[PDB]
Amino acid sequence: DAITKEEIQSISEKIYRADTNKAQKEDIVLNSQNCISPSETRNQVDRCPKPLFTYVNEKLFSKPTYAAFINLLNNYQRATGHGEHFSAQELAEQDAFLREIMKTAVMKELYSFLHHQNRYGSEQEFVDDLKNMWFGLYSRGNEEGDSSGFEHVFSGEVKKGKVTGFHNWIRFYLEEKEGLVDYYSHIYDGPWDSYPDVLAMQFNWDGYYKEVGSAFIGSSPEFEFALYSLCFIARPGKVCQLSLGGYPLAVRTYTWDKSTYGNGKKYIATAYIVS
Ligand SMILES: [Ca+2]
Ligand SMILES: [Ca+2]
Ligand SMILES: [Ca+2]
Ligand SMILES: [Ca+2]
Ligand SMILES: [Ca+2]
């Protein structure tokens, strides 16, 4: 069944209200500090001397979907050109993440919507497709299987001396805590006055610069995984107009176009919040 623009905006609001594992107001203290003009993002000047996350209540990271998500963030080599080889325990981490997110109201809402729209006949089929499109390996650089949709969006990569991808707040917080991310500034702070919020950030990640990295702030991993999958499944390759807490938010997805899985199906090249 065709998924309409109106149907996308209804399910995106259902996903937003169902996100009970999101950070509560008291679980994160943000310090956005200096905002610069979009014309100054190539300056590479650190205008924020304090970390972006002044405090995060790390008990949030004991929630099973956060623990399973964080367990995946040490499985990759950010520099493209280095093939990825997952251990049996690392493939079990992918299954554990998918099993944990499927227990949430967020993923139950998305699967129910997609099943009603006749895109998937079963949860098993849907989980298998998600595992392929997100965790399947493809080649961005010098070696085979150095990248994936999940690595690009959630872990972040370095290609040709610049940061590429890197759109997740938990990954940002954990690297910043280790001194591996240095927050420089933002150009945009979304209309939400609660979590999830959106910030468009400039930052240095262990020697490489990210010019405009838009990220949800305070969302659970299942919220982000559901919305990015919704945009990719319903509108692959296009800008999908979501509605979140009554405010519009546009997301771009692109298919990977150098390889396929199964019967000519596409891996996710990227999913991101547009400027
Ligand atoms: Ca429909
Ligand atoms: Ca791991
Ligand atoms: Ca990699
Ligand atoms: Ca700084
Ligand atoms: Ca805001």
Numbering used by the authors: 134 to 408
Authors' text:
Human EndoU (hEndoU) was first identified as human placental protein 11 (PP11) due to its prevalence in the placenta. These results indicate EndoU is a calcium-activated ribonuclease targeting a large repertoire of RNAs.
The structure revealed five calcium ions, with one aiding crystal packing and four potentially activating the protein. Each calcium ion is coordinated by seven oxygen atoms from acidic side-chains, backbone carbonyl groups, or protein-stabilized water molecules. Comparing apo-XendoU, apo-EndoU, and calcium-activated EndoU structures revealed conformational changes upon calcium binding that mainly cluster nearby protein loops. The side-chain of E290, located midway between site (1) and the catalytic triad, flips to engage with a water molecule in the calcium coordination network. The bonding correlates with a disorder-to-order transition in the loop carrying E290, forming a β-hairpin and stabilizing the catalytic site. Our data show a model for the calcium-dependent regulation of EndoU through allostery, with site (1) and residue E290 as key mediators in the intramolecular signaling leading to EndoU activation.
